[PDB]
Design a protein around this nucleic acid. Structure first.
Ligand SMILES: [Zn+2]
Lengths: 134, 127, 272, 80, 22, 645, 56, 164
RNA sequence: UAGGGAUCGGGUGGUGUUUUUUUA
RNA sequence: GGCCGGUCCGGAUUUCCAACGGGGCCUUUCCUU
């Protein structure tokens, strides 16, 4: 296993070429989220197009905070959502052709990786306990 | 592993293989104090604190003074009557090297701890 | 040299002058042997700073790559000094033109801890952090001779006695030792037939120096095998850097040639 | 080889990997592109990861690649 | 393109309206 | 000790009892405790009890200021001002002038050589400091030669062989003692320590040290007050050593006193002519107070009290002209103070008072605000002490000197041959009658457009402040009274004119109409109320009450309260004047509520008219409610509150 | 100046009041460290001057 | 006009007159000096002798001072010349010292903080500027460390990873 | 224990040949 | 503790600058908690 990560800069009064305001950023963010875009995708879209560095350093607060602050928050965290729907897609594929024991092994690993952050999220209680795999 | 312990392993074996400068991250403040007192006693040389936002990188430049640092796991309480027997079964000889304790009023080695007449729990050692 | 360089005389208990550029400590310093008002220092900014005490001011600074351990001026040339820095070579600098370190004495394997000149002004001596001192001619740039012994270790301060005959090497294991400079000569008065013979075949070795077995005999020493391994793997990685540089120089348009003497300089205040 | 483990030469800092330096940083860079339909400015990332479309004259500006996104053949950019 | 028909609490509002109207 | 180490340590978080009050304690303590025989010995003995082991520079320096606190307590109370402390000082001056084969020795540890021999000397140095400030007990008529000749042979040792701690104070003592004529051996000691400070400057490679600065002050006193100063080339060397230090003026001070002393004793030194150049330079460009002032003192004393070449004596004034434009805002003021001293404490004033007048005019026309006041003051002082021909040509160039002519006319009038000034006022009247064209009408039109550069105006307002021709001027003053501060100055001029000599109704209505569509406006409102009380009597009174109701933002509300205070028969004229003052019965709103309480306090007929006016306001509220209910901004009736909060 | 050019226009007496035939003096000055760099550049020049003696 | 409610100084009135002067020369500015406000200014000399003006802005207008800061600071370095000028924020606390440093230097950058711990027990706290604007940046570094010194108590040395 | 030469997968930069050009 | 007159030809008056220490004190003003 190796490293593949972004290295956010030492600057935090970013970025001094930013002509744009700090309210149109929040406007674009709520536009994209009520268009139905996950936090990662709204971040990358306004990173590329309406070029921000990151909204946590242009606005004073991260985008999950401003999504909750504008009443648009998710009901499950993004990672658990993506990993759940990956689990249901691999389950649908194995249900279609049940001989794929490699998909069985991968499904065991995917469900274990579900249970990891599931019990993490129960211990921190972002989504409430009694919760076990929808 | 710990954060003080691997930094001490780094500056131990790096001068065992005989270099002059080492790097150590994540550089907590107990590492700051721990090699603060050893450059006070003249076992390393000057050291820089590169400060990013993540954790910080301490760069120690050192000559061939030192031969062994080391931490003690776990960190348990010792008395004024105990620090002499800990310097006995922890250092090679008596008046040579030091033993570093987290005392209550500061962070010091054994001789300044018994000079200020305080104690605390044992932290690490260097000779 | 401390956290800031102070000038004081022995008649008053206060620093007569501060002298530093800015906030950086001064790792060593040395006065001159002639034009005694001028002096040099080396700070942990990897920097050489010359000071003149007539104007009572620092007067130029260069920054090199790695930290300069110790300066020593020239007794004869009086405006040439030698810096010993932590990349494994000493640098015979000028003073009046500080942009080209006009000689580089190269053959070490670790940090060069100090250096001084012979009092005759043409043969310098470096002692380094590897367990070996060595003596250089001024106008070559490679080792005339290597001294080492098993008991000396991490030799920190080597100086040259005031009659250019002995090399005092103070190590890190405690001991301070004497060496001869010309390691084959002896220190008694000689009858003139011996003086004529030793001087005769000295001149004779000098003129037949480039024959390819006189050269291998007069070049053969016995280094400790730590220094042998480090020198040969330094050679293979330097050949590798030279080869990859040759490939880039074959392709790329303008990778301009920099001299070996100009390589280590990373900067200089007062460009002219 | 043998390097000053403090502040090294900028020629080596721009040479080594963006994680392995003494203080890590980015290497992507923002840049102003002129969409050639109606000439007006928009910023764009370098490793742009998605097809930006300048909503004024909504043609296309850069298609993404594994690294730096290549720009679309009539565009003109200022690095900033 | 990559919009989602899930994942938001206004989307659980619209789908509870769905699951009570149908 | 350990409490001080824990108080100045670092791994020690907080408490309220942190600031060390002990240094203040001892300076408050020895006031009572100055027995100066026994308890003072029990003060100074624990000093030595730590001063026999090891003391760093930190502990040394805090102990040195602790001894300064002791000496400040002695300055407060000096318990006996008759020589029992002086014998004590003299007392402390006298005080501070094969067997190993059997010997087991175990746990060997070496000591260090520092412990005895640093403390052999440092205690002596600190005792000499303490004692010698005790000799700078400054009480007059306690210095006699019979008092001090016991102390001269002790201080003559600790001047020479002291190493820098006390020397600065010993020659401070000699500065205090240079007045009293001592014995011959001691005057030899004075000249010997003059040679000592000469060797100090010869050895020290900087004059900006406290030692050389204090020694320069001593050589200042030795230059000023002795019989025969000598070694003139040696003091020329000293001055040549001084001159390259003046790129950095930093507590030079004492050095400028030295310059004062030898320029007062008037020794011809050719390097002083370069000293004057550099002190002019630092006099302008130096960015501190009082160093520029002492440089003005030395440069001025040189310029007035030394000779000069007959081109250089005007070249320095050309430098004065070239520094009169200086870009900082206080160096120019220092230039102005030196020009003030030039004009004050001569035919040189007449010879230079043309260029100086032109440059002071150009500095009056400068951009610095508070420097313009000094420019006006120096212009007045230059015009008053001027000669006949100089002031005549000055007034001629000021008259002939278009907005340039306006500003020069204003300046010449402000300086203002009173008949010649009236002739200049006649040409200024030719300017002023042409200087009133539709400006106040354009201002009222701009006010109406808002509700929908005045350079010659301010110059003519200044001319009106200076002043049937005056009646025509007062008529034009009403034309510009009827650019906010310009109209305020015009209103002040018209108020002064109407206080000097239908018209009152027009003036009061034009005053009221200006407030609707400042402190000068408050002054004009008080003047207009004076005119209304001096005044179709009942018709104009109803017009004034209607104007007050049309008035009743903070300035207009204060004008309404002022008009109601000027109005308050008690109610037979004030029936039509409480139509808005009772309607008002947010710090401006709190002041308006205080104004409503003032109008209510300052009566049976008035209370009846007030109750009828309250019923009339209820009727007007009913009429507005009927208009609204017949009209029926649904969401706009709450949009104001939803946008406010 | 503008005031001087508007005043001194007619009369022949100019050599008494219009002494300003030369431009201004006395720059800002430069800040402390920059002044240090400049005069120590001058120090390096005079030091090289004083060891070019030793060259011969 | 646009100060906080306490009575200002006369030089505060002079720089406010410079502000209303730039507002008199209006239509080259994009109504940028309409929402201005400052709590207080204060001027203090440096060891170089010349003074520096800390102007405390109540911080929507630190970012409101957006691209106007360079133009108006050369404008008022012409108008109220020769005194180095800076705009600042106001009231853990390492964050507020960090932020007042970050806008204290310029809107240029800082790129890294070092602090070396010498062999005598002392420390030297270096801050590292960007690479740019250096001809006007180098003229005010001692002023910056002086105002950070007397505004924090801390000791800071500024330098650029460049020649000087 | 470290160093070196390759090679596979990705990326960055260089600037010569294979390549091509208004279809992607 | 230093720097400036203005009373008279060195004793009393005064301004500013520094160093200690003294006093009122600037920041939860709007909100359940
Ligand atoms: Zn377009």
């Amino acid at each position: 296993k190796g490293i593949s990560s972004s290295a956010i800069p030492y600057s935090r009064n970013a970025p001094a070429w930013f002509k744009l305001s700090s309210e149109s950023v929040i406007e674009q963010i709520v536009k994209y989220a009520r268009k139905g875009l996950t936090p990662s995708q709204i971040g990358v879209l306004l990173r590329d197009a309406h070029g921000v560095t990151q909204a946590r350093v242009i606005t004073g607060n991260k985008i999950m905070r401003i999504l909750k602050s504008n009443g648009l928050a998710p009901e499950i965290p993004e990672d658990l959502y993506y990993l759940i729907k990956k689990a249901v897609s691999v389950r649908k594929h194995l249900e279609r052709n049940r001989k794929d024991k490699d998909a069985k092994f991968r499904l065991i690993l995917i469900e274990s990786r579900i249970h990891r952050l599931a019990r993490y999220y129960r211990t921190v209680a972002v989504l409430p306990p009694n919760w076990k795999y929808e | 592993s710990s954060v003080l312990a691997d930094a001490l392993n780094a500056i131990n074996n790096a001068e065992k293989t005989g270099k002059r400068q080492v790097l150590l991250r994540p550089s907590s403040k107990v590492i700051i104090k721990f090699l603060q007192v050893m450059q006070k006693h003249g076992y390393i040389g000057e050291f820089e604190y590169i400060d990013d936002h993540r954790s910080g990188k301490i760069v120690v430049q050192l000559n061939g003074r030192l031969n062994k640092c080391g931490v003690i796991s776990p960190r348990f309480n010792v008395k004024i009557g105990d620090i002499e027997k800990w310097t006995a079964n922890l250092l090679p000889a008596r008046q040579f090297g030091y033993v570093i304790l987290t005392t209550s009023a500061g962070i010091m080695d054994h001789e300044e701890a018994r000079r200020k007449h305080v104690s605390g729990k044992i932290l690490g050692f260097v000779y | 040299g401390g956290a800031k360089i102070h000038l004081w005389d022995v008649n008053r208990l206060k620093p007569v002058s501060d002298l530093s550029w800015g906030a950086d400590n001064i790792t060593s310093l040395k006065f001159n042997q002639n034009e005694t008002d001028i002096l040099a220092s080396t700070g942990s900014d990897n920097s050489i700073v010359l000071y003149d005490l007539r104007t009572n001011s620092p007067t130029q600074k260069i920054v090199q790559t790695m930290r300069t351990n110790a300066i020593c001026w020239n007794p004869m040339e009086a405006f040439n000094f030698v810096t010993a820095n932590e990349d494994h070579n000493a640098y015979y600098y000028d003073m009046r033109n500080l942009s080209r370190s006009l000689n580089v004495f190269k053959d070490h394997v670790s940090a060069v801890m100090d250096v001084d000149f012979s009092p005759t002004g043409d043969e310098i001596v470096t002692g380094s952090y590897d367990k070996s001192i060595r003596i250089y001619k001024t106008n070559h740039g490679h080792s005339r001779e290597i001294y080492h012994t098993k008991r000396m270790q991490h030799v920190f301060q080597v100086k040259y006695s005031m009659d250019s005959k002995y090399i005092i090497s103070g190590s890190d294991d405690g001991n301070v030792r004497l060496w001869r400079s010309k390691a084959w000569e002896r220190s008694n008065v000689k009858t003139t037939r011996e003086k004529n013979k030793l001087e005769y075949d000295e001149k004779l070795k000098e003129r037949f120096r480039h024959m390819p077995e006189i050269k291998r005999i007069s070049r053969h020493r016995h280094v400790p095998q730590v220094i042998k391994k480090a020198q040969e793997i330094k050679n293979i990685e330097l050949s590798s850097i030279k080869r990859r540089e040759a490939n880039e120089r074959r392709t790329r348009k303008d990778m301009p040639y920099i001299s070996e003497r100009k390589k280590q300089i990373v900067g200089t205040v007062h460009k002219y | 080889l043998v390097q000053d483990l403090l502040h090294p030469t900028a020629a080596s800092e721009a040479r080594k990997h963006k994680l392995k330096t003494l203080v890590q940083g980015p290497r992507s860079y923002f840049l102003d592109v002129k969409c050639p339909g109606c000439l007006n400015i928009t910023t764009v990332f370098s490793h742009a990861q998605t097809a930006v479309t300048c909503e004024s004259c909504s043609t296309i500006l850069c298609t993404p690649t594994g690294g730096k996104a290549k720009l679309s053949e009539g565009t003109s950019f200022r690095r900033k | 393109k990559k919009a989602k028909k899930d994942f938001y609490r206004f989307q659980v509002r619209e789908r509870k309206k769905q699951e009570i109207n149908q | 000790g350990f409490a001080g180490e824990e108080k100045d340590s670092e791994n020690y978080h907080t408490k309220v009892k942190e600031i060390k009050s002990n240094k203040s304690y001892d300076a408050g303590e020895i006031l009572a405790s100055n027995i100066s025989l026994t308890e003072f010995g029990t003060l100074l003995s624990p000093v030595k009890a730590l001063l026999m082991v090891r003391i760093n520079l930190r502990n040394q320096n805090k102990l040195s200021e602790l001894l300064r606190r002791y000496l400040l307590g002695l300055n407060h109370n000096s318990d006996s001002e008759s020589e029992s402390i002086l014998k004590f000082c003299h007392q402390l001056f006298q005080e501070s002038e094969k067997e190993d084969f059997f010997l087991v020795n175990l746990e060997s540890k070496s000591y260090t050589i520092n412990s005895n021999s640093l403390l052999l000397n440092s205690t002596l140095q600190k005792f000499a400091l303490d004692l010698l400030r005790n000799v700078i007990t400054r009480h007059r008529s306690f210095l006699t030669v019979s008092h001090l000749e016991g102390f001269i042979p002790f201080l003559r040792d600790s001047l020479l062989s002291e190493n820098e701690g006390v020397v600065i104070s010993t020659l401070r003592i000699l500065i205090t003692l240079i007045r009293l004529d001592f014995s011959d051996e001691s005057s030899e000691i004075f000249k010997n320590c003059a040679r000592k400070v000469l060797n100090i400057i010869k050895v020290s490679p900087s004059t900006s040290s406290e030692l050389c600065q204090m020694g320069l002050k001593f050589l200042s006193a030795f230059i000023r007050h002795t019989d025969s100063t000598l070694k003139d080339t040696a003091l020329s060397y000293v001055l040549g050593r001084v001159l390259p230090d003046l790129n950095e003026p930093s507590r030079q001070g004492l050095a400028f006193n030295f310059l004062k002393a030898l320029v007062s004793k008037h020794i011809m030194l050719p390097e002083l002519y370069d000293i004057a150049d550099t002190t002019r330079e630092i006099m302008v460009t130096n960015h501190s107070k009082e160093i520029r002032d002492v440089s003005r003192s030395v440069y001025y004393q040189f310029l007035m009290e030394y000779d000069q070449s007959k081109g250089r004596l005007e070249k320095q004034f050309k430098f004065m002209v070239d520094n009169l434009q200086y870009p900082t805002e206080s160096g120019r003021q220092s230039v102005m103070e030196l020009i003030n001293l030039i004009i004050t404490k001569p035919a040189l004033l007449s010879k230079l008072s043309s260029s100086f007048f032109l440059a002071l005019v150009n500095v009056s026309f400068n951009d610095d605000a508070p420097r313009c006041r000094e420019m006006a003051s120096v212009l007045i002082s230059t015009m008053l002490p001027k000669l006949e021909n100089k002031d005549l040509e000055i007034v001629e160039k000021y008259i002939a000197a278009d907005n340039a002519s306006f500003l020069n006319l204003g300046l010449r009038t402000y300086k203002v041959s009173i008949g010649f000034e009236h002739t200049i006022e006649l040409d200024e009247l030719a300017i002023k009658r042409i200087r009133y064209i539709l400006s106040d009408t354009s201002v009222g039109s701009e006010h109406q457009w808002d509700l929908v550069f005045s350079s010659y105006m301010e110059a003519t307002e200044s001319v009106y402040k200076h002043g049937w021709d005056g009646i025509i001027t007062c008529l034009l003053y009403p034309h510009s009274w009827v650019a906010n501060l310009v109209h305020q100055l015009i209103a002040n001029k018209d108020k002064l004119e109407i206080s000097l000599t239908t018209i009152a109704t027009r003036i009061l209505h034009q005053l009221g109409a200006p407030s609707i569509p400042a402190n000068v406006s408050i002054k004009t409102l008080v003047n207009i109320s004076i005119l209304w009380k001096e005044q179709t009597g009942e018709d104009l009174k109803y017009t004034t009450a209607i104007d007050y109701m049309v008035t009743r933002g903070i300035i207009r509300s204060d004008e309404h309260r002022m008009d109601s205070f000027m109005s308050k028969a008690l109610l037979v004229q004030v029936l039509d004047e409480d139509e808005v003052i009772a309607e008002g019965e947010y710090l401006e709103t709190y002041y308006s509520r205080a104004v409503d309480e003032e109008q209510e306090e300052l009566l049976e007929d008035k209370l009846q008219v007030s109750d009828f006016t309250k019923i009339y306001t209820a009727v007007k509220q009913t009429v507005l409610e009927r208009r609204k209910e017949r009209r029926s901004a649904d969401k706009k009736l709450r949009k104001h509150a939803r946008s406010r909060e | 100046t503008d005031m001087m050019n508007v005043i001194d226009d007619r009369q022949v007496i100019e050599n008494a009041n219009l002494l300003k035939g030369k431009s201004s003096t006395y720059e800002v000055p430069l800040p402390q460290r920059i002044q240090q760099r400049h005069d120590r550049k001058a120090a390096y020049e005079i030091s090289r001057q004083e060891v070019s003696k030793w060259n011969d | 006009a646009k100060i906080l409610s306490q009575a200002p100084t006369e030089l505060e009135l002079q720089v406010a007159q410079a502000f209303v002067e730039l507002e008199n020369s209006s239509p080259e500015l994009k109504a940028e000096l309409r929402p201005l406000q400052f709590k207080s200014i204060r001027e203090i000399d440096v060891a170089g002798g010349k003074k520096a003006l800390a102007i405390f802005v109540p911080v929507p207008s630190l970012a409101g001072f957006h691209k106007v800061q360079t133009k108006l600071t050369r404008e008022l370095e012409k108008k109220f010349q020769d005194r180095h000028v800076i705009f600042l924020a106001e009231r853990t606390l390492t964050a507020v010292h960090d932020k007042i440093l970050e806008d204290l230097v310029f809107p240029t950058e800082i790129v890294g903080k070092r602090v070396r711990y010498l062999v005598g027990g002392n420390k030297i706290q270096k801050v590292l500027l960007d690479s740019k604007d250096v001809q006007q940046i180098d003229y005010k570094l001692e002023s910056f460390q002086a105002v950070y010194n007397k505004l924090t108590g801390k000791q800071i040395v500024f330098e650029i990873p460049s020649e000087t």
